[PDB]
Subunit: 125 residues, 3 copies
């Protein structure tokens, strides 16, 4: 049940220009599919499968720097290191960083953020 | 205004098989209604009412373990302990855990996660 | 790349009564537009531009205190202090608090919460 651990949160654009998607639902499928693919690959190499909860969102920033009025379509990916499956937090933390950089590449992103946050996880099973 | 406290985050499936829901909006109403019900019950017993902000999402994991392509419908519930209403963080923390386990039961979930995160809350009123 | 910093999270209502909005998409545009406006103003005074990732949500609380069945439309705004643009975490933290109070005023909110959370940011560029 109880355990002090890490959660991650990744924010990424959806590059509608490159992928030609027109709805948020399409962008969520795009990013979900890409994550499913690269997490699987990395799982078959390290036996660490990093799941992700993904939410659609909009990022609001300066219109002078090219943000559309009221914000730009983005996706947020979150996940947590469950010590029932994760034996080393550092190996997991390095795997997340690896997947973050690969997601940035697959999504053709100029920038991407990956945060880690200390969290106390309760897992009911 | 300022105060160092706890926030919780709960991730749960929506069990479309059990409840026969076909849209995300239906799943959000389902989980919102259940939470409204059990938080009320627990409030009438402990005088602690735990509110929750709920967001629809998708959880992406291995397709070999039964995840649909691009992810499975989930809901995220978040909330924070406001010291203007919460006199003991530990009683609140135990009440959240109680509601988490009850939500897992009402949602017929095999598993469920409940995290607590240290946060500095500013409450403007 | 690596850096220990702060993230913020703001939860706000959308006051459909005041603004006469009928869809979530309308409420997201409303809040996105307001944030874009006040962050720009504050940027031109302090040279700190605070971006925000915004998500629609519902807040579930007691129906006796006026919450609709299954929850009330809300918006969640999140952001992070990137030390590549933020030279003083305290000036940034004060600017977020400033924008939070201004957003509360522009949204005609009785209450509003603003949380800060310690986070380790990895910025890929």
């Amino acid at each position: 049940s109880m355990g002090k651990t890490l959660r991650f949160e990744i924010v990424s654009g959806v590059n509608k220009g490159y992928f030609h998607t027109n709805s948020q639902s399409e962008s969520l499928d795009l990013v979900g599919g890409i994550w499913q693919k690269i997490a699987k690959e990395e799982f078959e190499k390290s036996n660490i499968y990093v799941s992700a909860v993904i939410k659609p969102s909009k990022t609001v920033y300066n219109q002078e720097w090219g943000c559309p009025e009221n914000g730009e379509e983005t996706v947020v990916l979150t996940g947590v290191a469950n010590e029932e499956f994760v034996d080393d937090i550092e190996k997991w933390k390095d795997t997340v960083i690896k997947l973050a950089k690969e997601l940035k590449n697959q999504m053709k992103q100029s920038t991407l953020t990956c945060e880690f946050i200390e969290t106390e996880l309760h897992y009911f099973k």
